[PDB]
Amino acid sequence: AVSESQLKKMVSKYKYRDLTVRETVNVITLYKDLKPVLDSYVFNDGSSRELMNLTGTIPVPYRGNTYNIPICLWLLDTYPYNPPICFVKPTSSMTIKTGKHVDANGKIYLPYLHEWKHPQSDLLGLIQVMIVVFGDEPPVFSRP
């Protein structure tokens, strides 16, 4: 958590903040799992900006079981890619056996993403598809 005053203060730099908050509010509102985060990073070789990421865990049942597959998201102010990037975050105990879209970088190489032409696509769906893809095949895996 980071209150609404501090949360905004963190995304106060963002240009599409109002748009970001909206997406988030929904993301969370829809799923009370993805928590808002804020992480800064340099640029080029000196510059630095503030970018917020969405880290959480979604319940992925399998064979009547229950799994916890985490996911991290990246946001931007406007550029380069207006739309945020989706990617799975690997753990230390578990492993990442990639997936149909889950690349080696845990990035979602979905065909709907690359060709995401909002409002056609959205975060809700971006997460939905996963719930399915993952709900069918765990891209995490950890059975050596």
Which labels suit this protein?
globular; 4 strands; cell cycle; about 25% strand; about 30% helix; 4 helices; alpha+beta; about 140 residues; Tumor susceptibility gene 101 protein
Description:
The protein is of the alpha+beta class and 144 residues long. It has one domain (1-144): Ubiquitin Conjugating Enzyme, CATH 3.10.110. 28% of the residues lie in helices and 26% in strands. It has 4 helices and 4 strands; from the N terminus they run ααββββαα. The chain has helices spanning 3-10, 17-30, 111-114, 123-136; strands at residues 35-43, 47-62, 65-74, 85-87. A 4-stranded antiparallel sheet has the order 1-2-3-4, covered by helices on one side. Strand 1 (35-43) and strand 2 form a beta hairpin. The radius of gyration is 16 Å and the shape is globular. It starts with a helix and ends in an 8-residue tail after the last helix. It is classed as cell cycle. Keywords: E2 fold, cell cycle.
Topology at a glance:
Layout: H1 3-10, H2 17-30, E1 35-43, E2 47-62, E3 65-74, E4 85-87, H3 111-114, H4 123-136
Antiparallel strand pairs: 1-2, 2-3, 3-4
What is CATH's topology name?
Ubiquitin Conjugating Enzyme
Number of helices: 4
Number of E strands = 4
Give helix % range. Answer: 25-40%
Compact overview of the structure:
28% of the residues lie in helices and 26% in strands.
